């Protein structure tokens, strides 16, 4: 019937709003990784300094 | 259909994040391995 065709358009809309805000989730996620990563680099810099003395 | 198109672009970028993410995780693990080695050093 035509139920399948209507459902698919809902389903396709579902996917796009799910995909769009998934990439938006990626942005936030990655921003936090950068914070963690610059912290690790600061920690390495102090450990290298400590292993030199 | 225009919504059909941007669904594909959304999924494209979504794939680009995915591969980028794999690279970044390897990088994070590398820094942690380096820290581990450094902390092991001194110590002694």
């Amino acid at each position: 019937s035509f139920n399948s065709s209507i459902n698919n358009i809902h389903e396709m809309e579902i996917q796009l709003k799910d995909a769009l805000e998934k990439n938006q989730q990626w942005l936030v996620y990655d921003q936090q990784r950068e914070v963690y990563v610059k912290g690790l680099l600061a920690k390495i810099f102090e450990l290298e300094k400590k292993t030199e003395t | 259909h225009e919504m059909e198109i941007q669904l594909k672009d959304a999924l494209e970028k979504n794939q680009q994040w995915l591969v980028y993410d794999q690279q970044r995780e390897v990088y994070v693990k590398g820094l942690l391995a380096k820290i581990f080695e450094l902390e092991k050093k001194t110590e002694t």
Binding site: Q32, R33 | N14, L32
Partner: peptide
């Protein structure tokens, strides 16, 4: 399907 990050907040390995 679309894939999102393993969490909403970054969790280190």
């Amino acid at each position: 399907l679309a894939v999102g990050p393993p969490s909403l907040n970054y969790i280190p390995p």
